[PDB]
Amino acid sequence: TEQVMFQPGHIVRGIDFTEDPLLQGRLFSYLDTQLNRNGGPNFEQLPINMPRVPIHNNNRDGAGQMFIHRNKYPYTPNTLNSGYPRQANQNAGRGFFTAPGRTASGALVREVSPTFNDHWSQPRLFFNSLTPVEQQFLVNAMRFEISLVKSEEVKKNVLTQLNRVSHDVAVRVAAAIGLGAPDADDTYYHNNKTAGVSIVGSGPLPTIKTLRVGILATTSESSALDQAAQLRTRLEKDGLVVTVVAETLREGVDQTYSTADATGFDGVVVVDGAAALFSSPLFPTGRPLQIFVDAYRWGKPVGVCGGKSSEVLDAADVPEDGDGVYSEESVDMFVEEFEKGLATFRFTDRFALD
Amino acid sequence: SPLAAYEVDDSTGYLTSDVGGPIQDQTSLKAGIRGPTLLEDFMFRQKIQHFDHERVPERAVHARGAGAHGTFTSYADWSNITAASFLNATGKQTPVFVRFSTVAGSRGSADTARDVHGFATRFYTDEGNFDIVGNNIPVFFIQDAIQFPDLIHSVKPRPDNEIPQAATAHDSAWDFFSQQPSTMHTLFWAMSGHGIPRSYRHMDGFGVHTFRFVKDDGSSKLIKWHFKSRQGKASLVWEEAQVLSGKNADFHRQDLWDAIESGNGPEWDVCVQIVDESQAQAFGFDLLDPTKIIPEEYAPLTKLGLLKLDRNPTNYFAETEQVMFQPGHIVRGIDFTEDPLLQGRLFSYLDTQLNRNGGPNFEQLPINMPRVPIHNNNRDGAGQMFIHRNKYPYTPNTLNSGYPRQANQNAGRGFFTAPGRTASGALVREVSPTFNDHWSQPRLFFNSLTPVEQQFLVNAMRFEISLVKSEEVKKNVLTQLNRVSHDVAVRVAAAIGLGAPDADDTYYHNNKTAGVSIVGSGPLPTIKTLRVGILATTSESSALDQAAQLRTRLEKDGLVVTVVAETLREGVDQTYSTADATGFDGVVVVDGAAALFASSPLFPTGRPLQIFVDAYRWGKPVGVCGSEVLDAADVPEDGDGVYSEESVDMFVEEFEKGLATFRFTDRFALD
Amino acid sequence: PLAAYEVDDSTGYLTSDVGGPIQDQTSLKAGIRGPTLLEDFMFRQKIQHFDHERVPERAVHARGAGAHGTFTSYADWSNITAASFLNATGKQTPVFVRFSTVAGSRGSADTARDVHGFATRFYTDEGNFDIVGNNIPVFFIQDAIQFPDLIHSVKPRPDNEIPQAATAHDSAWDFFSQQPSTMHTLFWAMSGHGIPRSYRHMDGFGVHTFRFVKDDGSSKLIKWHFKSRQGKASLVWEEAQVLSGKNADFHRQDLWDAIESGNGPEWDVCVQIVDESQAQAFGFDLLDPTKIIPEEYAPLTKLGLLKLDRNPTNYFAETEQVMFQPGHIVRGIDFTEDPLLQGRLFSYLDTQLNRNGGPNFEQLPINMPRVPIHNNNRDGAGQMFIHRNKYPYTPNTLNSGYPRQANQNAGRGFFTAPGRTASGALVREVSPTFNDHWSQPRLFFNSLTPVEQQFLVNAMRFEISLVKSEEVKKNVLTQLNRVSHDVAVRVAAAIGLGAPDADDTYYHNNKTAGVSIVGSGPLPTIKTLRVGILATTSESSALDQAAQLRTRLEKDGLVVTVVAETLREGVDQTYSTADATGFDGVVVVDGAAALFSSPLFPTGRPLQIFVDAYRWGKPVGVCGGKSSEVLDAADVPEDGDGVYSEESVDMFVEEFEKGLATFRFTDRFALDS
Ligand code: HDD
Numbered sequence A: 001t002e003q004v005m006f007q008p009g010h011i012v013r014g015i016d017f018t019e020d021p022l023l024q025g026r027l028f029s030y031l032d033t034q035l036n037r038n039g040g041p042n043f044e045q046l047p048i049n050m051p052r053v054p055i056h057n058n059n060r061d062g063a064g065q066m067f068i069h070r071n072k073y074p075y076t077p078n079t080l081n082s083g084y085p086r087q088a089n090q091n092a093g094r095g096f097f098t099a100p101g102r103t104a105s106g107a108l109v110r111e112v113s114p115t116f117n118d119h120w121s122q123p124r125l126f127f128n129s130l131t132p133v134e135q136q137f138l139v140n141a142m143r144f145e146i147s148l149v150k151s152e153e154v155k156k157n158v159l160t161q162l163n164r165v166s167h168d169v170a171v172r173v174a175a176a177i178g179l180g181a182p183d184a185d186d187t188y189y190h191n192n193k194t195a196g197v198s199i200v201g202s203g204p205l206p207t208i209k210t211l212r213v214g215i216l217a218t219t220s221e222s223s224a225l226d227q228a229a230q231l232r233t234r235l236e237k238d239g240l241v242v243t244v245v246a247e248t249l250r251e252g253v254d255q256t257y258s259t260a261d262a263t264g265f266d267g268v269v270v271v272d273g274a275a276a277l278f279s280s281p282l283f284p285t286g287r288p289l290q291i292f293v294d295a296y297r298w299g300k301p302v303g304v305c306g307g308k309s310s311e312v313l314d315a316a317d318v319p320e321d322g323d324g325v326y327s328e329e330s331v332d333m334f335v336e337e338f339e340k341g342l343a344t345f346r347f348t349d350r351f352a353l354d
Numbered sequence B: 001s002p003l004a005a006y007e008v009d010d011s012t013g014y015l016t017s018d019v020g021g022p023i024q025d026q027t028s029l030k031a032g033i034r035g036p037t038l039l040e041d042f043m044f045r046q047k048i049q050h051f052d053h054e055r056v057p058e059r060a061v062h063a064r065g066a067g068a069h070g071t072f073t074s075y076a077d078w079s080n081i082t083a084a085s086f087l088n089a090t091g092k093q094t095p096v097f098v099r100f101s102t103v104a105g106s107r108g109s110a111d112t113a114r115d116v117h118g119f120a121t122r123f124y125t126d127e128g129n130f131d132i133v134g135n136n137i138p139v140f141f142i143q144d145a146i147q148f149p150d151l152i153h154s155v156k157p158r159p160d161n162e163i164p165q166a167a168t169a170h171d172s173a174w175d176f177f178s179q180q181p182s183t184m185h186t187l188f189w190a191m192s193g194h195g196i197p198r199s200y201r202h203m204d205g206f207g208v209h210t211f212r213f214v215k216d217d218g219s220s221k222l223i224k225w226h227f228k229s230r231q232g233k234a235s236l237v238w239e240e241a242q243v244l245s246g247k248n249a250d251f252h253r254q255d256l257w258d259a260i261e262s263g264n265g266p267e268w269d270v271c272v273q274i275v276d277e278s279q280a281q282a283f284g285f286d287l288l289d290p291t292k293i294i295p296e297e298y299a300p301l302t303k304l305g306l307l308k309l310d311r312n313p314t315n316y317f318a319e320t321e322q323v324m325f326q327p328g329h330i331v332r333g334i335d336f337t338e339d340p341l342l343q344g345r346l347f348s349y350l351d352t353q354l355n356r357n358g359g360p361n362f363e364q365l366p367i368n369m370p371r372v373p374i375h376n377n378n379r380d381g382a383g384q385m386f387i388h389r390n391k392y393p394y395t396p397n398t399l400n401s402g403y404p405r406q407a408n409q410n411a412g413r414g415f416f417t418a419p420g421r422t423a424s425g426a427l428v429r430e431v432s433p434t435f436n437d438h439w440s441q442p443r444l445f446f447n448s449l450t451p452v453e454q455q456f457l458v459n460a461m462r463f464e465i466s467l468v469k470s471e472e473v474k475k476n477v478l479t480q481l482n483r484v485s486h487d488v489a490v491r492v493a494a495a496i497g498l499g500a501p502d503a504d505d506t507y508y509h510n511n512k513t514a515g516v517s518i519v520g521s522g523p524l525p526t527i528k529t530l531r532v533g534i535l536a537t538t539s540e541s542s543a544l545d546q547a548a549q550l551r552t553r554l555e556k557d558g559l560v561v562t563v564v565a566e567t568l569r570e571g572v573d574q575t576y577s578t579a580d581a582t583g584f585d586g587v588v589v590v591d592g593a594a595a596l597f598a599s600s601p602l603f604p605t606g607r608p609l610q611i612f613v614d615a616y617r618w619g620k621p622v623g624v625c626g627s628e629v630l631d632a633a634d635v636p637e638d639g640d641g642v643y644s645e646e647s648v649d650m651f652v653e654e655f656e657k658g659l660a661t662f663r664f665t666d667r668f669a670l671d
Numbered sequence C: 001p002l003a004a005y006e007v008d009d010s011t012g013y014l015t016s017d018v019g020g021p022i023q024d025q026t027s028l029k030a031g032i033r034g035p036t037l038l039e040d041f042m043f044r045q046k047i048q049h050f051d052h053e054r055v056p057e058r059a060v061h062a063r064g065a066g067a068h069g070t071f072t073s074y075a076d077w078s079n080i081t082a083a084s085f086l087n088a089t090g091k092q093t094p095v096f097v098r099f100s101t102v103a104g105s106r107g108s109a110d111t112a113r114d115v116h117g118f119a120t121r122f123y124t125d126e127g128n129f130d131i132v133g134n135n136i137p138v139f140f141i142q143d144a145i146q147f148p149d150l151i152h153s154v155k156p157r158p159d160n161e162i163p164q165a166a167t168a169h170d171s172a173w174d175f176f177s178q179q180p181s182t183m184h185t186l187f188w189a190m191s192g193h194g195i196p197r198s199y200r201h202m203d204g205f206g207v208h209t210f211r212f213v214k215d216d217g218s219s220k221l222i223k224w225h226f227k228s229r230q231g232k233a234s235l236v237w238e239e240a241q242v243l244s245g246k247n248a249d250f251h252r253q254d255l256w257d258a259i260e261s262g263n264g265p266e267w268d269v270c271v272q273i274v275d276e277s278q279a280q281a282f283g284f285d286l287l288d289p290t291k292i293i294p295e296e297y298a299p300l301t302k303l304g305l306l307k308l309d310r311n312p313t314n315y316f317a318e319t320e321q322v323m324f325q326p327g328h329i330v331r332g333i334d335f336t337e338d339p340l341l342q343g344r345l346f347s348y349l350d351t352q353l354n355r356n357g358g359p360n361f362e363q364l365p366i367n368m369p370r371v372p373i374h375n376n377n378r379d380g381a382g383q384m385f386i387h388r389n390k391y392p393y394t395p396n397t398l399n400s401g402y403p404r405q406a407n408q409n410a411g412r413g414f415f416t417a418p419g420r421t422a423s424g425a426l427v428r429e430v431s432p433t434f435n436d437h438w439s440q441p442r443l444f445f446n447s448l449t450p451v452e453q454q455f456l457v458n459a460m461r462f463e464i465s466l467v468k469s470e471e472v473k474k475n476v477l478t479q480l481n482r483v484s485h486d487v488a489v490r491v492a493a494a495i496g497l498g499a500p501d502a503d504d505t506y507y508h509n510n511k512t513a514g515v516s517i518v519g520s521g522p523l524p525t526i527k528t529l530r531v532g533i534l535a536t537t538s539e540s541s542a543l544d545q546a547a548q549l550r551t552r553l554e555k556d557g558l559v560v561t562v563v564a565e566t567l568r569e570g571v572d573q574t575y576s577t578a579d580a581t582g583f584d585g586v587v588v589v590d591g592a593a594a595l596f597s598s599p600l601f602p603t604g605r606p607l608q609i610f611v612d613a614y615r616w617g618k619p620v621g622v623c624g625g626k627s628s629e630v631l632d633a634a635d636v637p638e639d640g641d642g643v644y645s646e647e648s649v650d651m652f653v654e655e656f657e658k659g660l661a662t663f664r665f666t667d668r669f670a671l672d673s
């Protein structure tokens, strides 16, 4: 992983470049930068960079040369090596070739094409294609970052640009930073949308295999550990990665509350035998409840398995009728509901909107 | 062998990039037929980037050199003296790689510069690579490794103008020699024919330092390594070496390449002198002092095995340029001594490979790899070629079951420091008084040379010191030479118009030692590979016939025959235009060619005669096969190593004895 | 000009690199006969530095030498170029120049037969401007992508690394004969231009067509030609071979000494100037680097004087580390679409990463400009600057929009010539306008004198006779025959092959001025030329004669060496170290006639110096009136051109100095019938 040295210059017959000025310059950079990383010119000889076919060329020497070349006439044209290696091209040897329809015409210029000048219509297309809560998250990311910019001139300049994409984005961002948004400039505004760019609107996940379920239990009650073991079996059958959390480790318990966090899970279940946990030298004050509350706040499916849910849900201020909140005595019925929640993945109704 | 696995064949196939995509490499991609080149031309940039980065730093010393593969074979089970595995059975074979070199010149400098020479040998043993990084001279200029940059700065070119290349014939070198008297012994060796060997095959190798052989029982003895040439000892003469430097800078590397290609791979007996620890100070000098030899009269040689070089490299850069020797490449059964020159070398050779290789994984280059598995916790670094499976590379571990396991005297055939070694005393930056005699052994060496050999050494010093500009440095040089020999100082002073200081007899003596003289080492044991130039003419069919008759005979005797004429044709190898006496060990004129020795647009005026005359002056066997030629060349017909016979068989017999004699030293004037 | 970076060590106590006073002569040991300690930092810092002293040699032109100097403009050239260093009469700009061979490694001989580099940096008031040129005006190949092919073929064979610094091997001639573009440069390299007498006695050429661009955006096409004020001179081959052994440093020593004696070399920096419309008007394409513009078609315009007058202080720091680039360009100059030039632009920026080991190579003192640097390049290994601007991006407001963009209309920016265009398919195709590989080699050959043509034939006979492959030799004759049937016949005779039948497609009888060395006339100055006076210590009168001659010769700026058997007052060199390659002329004092055996020099050495000097074309003579003993011994005719015999020191010197200006007496060389 550290030594893999990628290059867009690693191209094969059947593919070619375009005159995109970003791509064009990349071709130079990736060949040059491997000299810095590798400290020498023979970086294509590292095992991860080698090809899976023979190499025939007249490259030679250089620090770290691993090959012992038999051909003592490494120049073209030669007769002393019978004209090998042979040149490869469109018509012989399956050579790479530049697309033969490509042309250039005009002055040699350091000028930007005017065809590149619309910087704002597509940002607006993208923004329009997000769901309302997704638009809120984006506004909130901008509010977070721009509030940390110290320069008031830079903040004003940012609002000027945002406003060219969307007046509403500029107004909502400006509100968090105590500036006024500039007046609407509708040159690039439009209502068009495009498919396949929204995450929130992309529907339930097509698989829940590998998703992480934290089961919050206690060693105080043998019944809680029994509940957690039953749930583990049922969830693991479907390819979920189960972590049982308790105060201390023992058989069947994977993690202590001290090392556990809601960020380690895609869904969190409390077994009702553990309801009393919801102070100790074994974990920070309020840690078990905090895991559940964080999971809920961050939109994850959460639930209580075993039949008695009010104590836990009330302590967490989680409504018992909420979308992505589960409560069942039956382990089978609990898991069937909870798995639908894992596929939904995020319950976006839990986030406030402007 | 790692070398076989990494060989790349390009005798067939279409050109590809380094990632296997078929490409072309002859025309740049352009915007139009007469347009500018495009940045998107990856074929151009990968090829030119490689070219732009082909070079690596030359070695800091011994930059100029050449290498070959071979085998070492043990003569016996040497367990009685060393635990070394490569020495543990009669007939045991270990692959080797040897690099020979000069010292001061940069990588494109002449092989035939006057210099100390390197002789570095890697034994790819079944218990790890073992390197003996030696020289062709058994003693070194300095007594402490910390002085190495001082020595090397002084002998390398002056740093304002980078003049002169590959030469000690300048003020700074002689300033250092005259201020640092330890240099006297090696200086005398370098000023002898040992500074200008006939070939890498006609020189010996020496480890220089005292080392230890260590037995499995922990006992140790002190040793010196001496690789004794089976080709004999031979030198150039100075004027010949100078001409050679211009006519063929690659003379020694070519000689080695050719000897191997012809099935005449050079051999050495790998020998040691072996003495007890109690004899460290018993011979009148300190065995820790790298400026001293053990005279053979005090400790004879034991022959351990045969070193033969018999395969040339496939790619010079990959093998010869990239081989990275280290005295730190040691194996169980050998140990260091407290020689302060050796001690500091251990640091330098591990460090310097970072400069050459540009990264820390230089032991992964095929030429540096061992021939046994590697088990250690070294990880990462630029150019990492391994994919290590052990995810717990720390000791002590349980998560990898304690592997790799520690190796030591009692486990895993570990290296161990000789257990009788001790240290005692203050922590000091002081030179042992036992190192203080800098002059007796140079005098021993000088005494052991033949009269003409002494003359050559005096003449080498006359040559170099006359080029020193500073009057003060020249006077300081005479002061030091005088402490070795008053006669040497007098004779050198005569050339430079200075007066030698009065005799100072403190270190004078008349003792001699065997095995250090080239001239006195007798005729060569073989003449195979030696070069015979036959000077002929295309103008007489008889001349070409005579040359062909000589060739047939000489070639069956293993000689390399070059027939020279005005122009090339069947049977003629070389034109007079490209021929020179430095290209031959013996020269024969066929009598049909006499007229050439009396103008042509095909060669420089007087070239045929100059070849014969130069060969004569430089002491080579010379002859005419078939009076007029000898008269023109002012060569006396009755001279030793001058042949004149009409009978080809008689001529060949006599001339071949001349080749073994190699140099006819009576042709040189003596003081 | 680099005074600010100099470090003086003429006084003081030894210190570490961090200023702690230390010693460096004895290692720290556990007892007086003990092992060395790892805690010896004095040892390790000194040896680590030594261990890392070397850097990769240049990929080509590894062997070379440099000097500092000044360029002075002859005029205000604003009417043809916006270049600031050319914008006023008398305007001075510091320069550094490096000269070199091409193929040999470091430590190879100066007097190898090769193309030579002539690279000039102008440290201008609007940036460093480099002209990275050679002593031959045309290049072997027509596309930069072929450079590794050319260079691999001429450099040593890669199995054994033989031969050093020479084209005289199979691979080089295989390439030349398979790639006919090489013929023009090949003919130049096989002439005396392959073995110049000194760096001071060769010219410099940019090779490529470049553009001069006015501030109004208009452009003209130019070729750079640096014309030596010392004259043109070559060695002869046999002399060059001996010199390679006797003094590998010959050219660098010649340059060093000329500067130290106050005889710093000079060149007129010139251009040929032609219109854009004349790109194909001269019967070849100006984008083709294998072609010259004959001077009959476009005369030289003299722009200013280049003088080298100061040697470096530290060779490594200055000469070894100077990193030239044709990408070091300034406003008023632009590139052309020469496909050789085009690819060079990439190579020289990239290769400095190999040499320097990091990206901050422009910070080395010798590479720094003499004006301020304002840009957003940050970090990298070896970063010496401490940048104050904490907003190094454009566009910015937090640094008030600085640095500002420079362009044609603001800030004196570089700008591409605005009339330049491109049109057509994106192609890896050679222009058919490049296809005539043989006419100009013929033009060059036709322009040489008869003895010069013989020398070129003889160089080819020498090299091709060393090619082992009979197929390669035949292929070489095929190519040579397309330039000249007579060249092919004469070369073939030495190698025992037949020349192919004449193919007259490209034969012609046209000639051009300014390319012959032999025909360039006597040298305009003899200052710095070397006179060896062969004397003896046996006769006090011989030493007296030598002293009188020395005084009279030194008066005229000649470098005099008195040679005798042994050194003393007035004698510079012994016979043992003396060689004819050390002199441009040789004089024997008649008091030394008896020398013409001893343990002090090789048998026949004194006579051999005189004979070699004669045979290599040098002025030779005997001063004093008694000349027959010496001349007869040397087989030198008293009445020969460039042979002098006079009793009068004054008269001898007058005649001899005319011979030094003639430089070579070419009637001593045999010609093919
Ligand atoms: C303290 C520094 C130092 C000292 C005292 C010596 N050397 Fe060394 N030697 C080096 C530092 C070094 C080096 C700078 O580390 C080199 C340059 C390339 C290399 O691998 O090591 C080297 C190269 C080198 C080579 C070339 C190996 C090859 O062919 O690649 C030989 C043969 C020797 N040395 C031999 C000797 C001998 C016989 C010495 C004294 C007995 C000696 N050196 C002292």
Ligand code: HDD
Pocket (backbone or CB within 6 Å): B048, B052, C058, C059, C060, C061, C064, C098, C099, C100, C116, C117, C118, C119, C132, C133, C134, C139, C143, C144, C145, C147, C206, C207, C208, C289, C322, C323, C324, C340, C343, C344, C347, C348, C351, C352
């Ligand atoms: C595409 C590769 C390429 C091509 C086609 C050329 N060169 Fe080059 N040249 C290099 C790649 C290079 C290089 C590898 O980049 C060097 C090695 C050291 C350096 O700085 O650049 C170099 C060095 C170099 C030097 C040595 C500069 C110095 O003294 O440090 C000179 C004088 C030239 N070249 C001159 C030429 C001329 C006159 C050329 C044809 C008109 C030419 N080169 C074509």
Ligand SMILES: [Ca+2]
Pocket (backbone or CB within 6 Å): A096, A097, A098, C427, C428
């Ligand atoms: Ca193509």
Ligand SMILES: [Ca+2]
Pocket (backbone or CB within 6 Å): B158, B170, B171, B172, B173
């Ligand atoms: Ca010096």
Ligand SMILES: [Ca+2]
Pocket (backbone or CB within 6 Å): B192, B193, B194, B235, B236, B453, B456, B518, B519
């Ligand atoms: Ca000798």
Ligand SMILES: [Ca+2]
Pocket (backbone or CB within 6 Å): C157, C169, C170, C171, C172
């Ligand atoms: Ca070759």
Ligand SMILES: [Ca+2]
Pocket (backbone or CB within 6 Å): C191, C192, C193, C234, C235, C452, C455, C517, C518
């Ligand atoms: Ca000439």
Ligand SMILES: [Ca+2]
Pocket (backbone or CB within 6 Å): A039, B358, C357
């Ligand atoms: Ca590096």
Ligand SMILES: [Ca+2]
Pocket (backbone or CB within 6 Å): A109, A110, C414, C415, C416
């Ligand atoms: Ca522009």
